[PDB]
Structure 1
C-alpha cells in the first residue's frame, strides 16, 4: 500500500498537465438544459454553446478552489472546509 497523500500528489501532478474536461458531458448537458428551462421554455442548444458553457464552468470552479485552498492554508490547515469557500466567496465580492 501507498501511504495516504501520495496518490493525491500524483493525482494533482497528473491533472495539471492534463487539459481536457473533468465533467461528464451528458450529466453536464442534462443539468444545463434543466437550468435553462427555468427562464424560458423549450430552448434549443448549439453543442458549441453547451461546450462553451462547460469550459467556463470548470474554469470557473478550479480558480475558486485555489482561492479556497489559500484560505485553508492561511488557517494553518491542509483540509479545505466550506467556510473557506464562503470567506473566499465574500472577498471577491460576489457573495
Structure 2
C-alpha cells in the first residue's frame, strides 16, 4: 500500500536512499541541536582523562563546550569528506576520503 514491506513486492517509487536523508538534511539544517548523547560523552571525556589526572572533575560548561567543539570538528571533517567523494565521482563518503582530508590539513601527519 503506502509502504507495505512485510513479505515483499517489487516496490514503486518510494523513499530512495537519499530521500529520508534530505528530510534529515532539512531537519538538522532547519534547527540547531546536539546530535551526540551527553551521558556516554561525559563518560568518554572522563575515561580518557583519567590517566592524565586521577579522579578528574568536570564542570557543566566544560563538558558541553568540549562536546560542541568535538561535534563541530566532526561536522567540519564531514563537509570536507563529502566534497572529496564527489571529486572521486562518488556520492558516498568512504575511508579513502577521510584519509586524504586529515593528511592534506596536516592533522593526520
TM-score scaled by length of structure 1 = 0.94
RMSD: 1.0
Query: Once the two structures are superposed, what CA deviation does each residue of 1:10-61 show, in whole Å capped at 9, x if it has no partner?
Result: 1111101221210000011111100111211111110111111111010110
> How far 1:83 sits from its partner (Å)?
1.4
RCO higher in 1 or 2 (8 Å CA, sep ≥ 6)? 1
Structure 1 position 27 matched with structure 2 position 48: no
Task: Give distance in 1, aligned partners of 2:17 and 2:95.
Answer: 22
TM-score calculated relative to the size of structure 2: 0.82
Q: Distance in 2 between matches of 1:67 and 1:48?
A: 29
SS state at 1:71 partner: helix
Map of 2:84 onto structure 1? 71
Separation (CA, whole Å) in 1 of partners of 2:33 and 2:19? 23
**Structure 1 gap ranges (5+):** none
Structure 1 distance, partners of 2:49, 2:88, is 38
Q: Which runs of 5+ in 2 are unaligned?
A: 1-13
Instruction: Give the number of the structure whose alpha-carbon radius of gyration is greater.
Output: 2
**Which structure's residues are more often helix, by fraction?**
1
Taking the aligned partners of 1:76 and 1:58, their CA distance within structure 2 comes to: 27
Please identify runs of 4+ aligned residues in structure 1 that moved more than 6 A: none
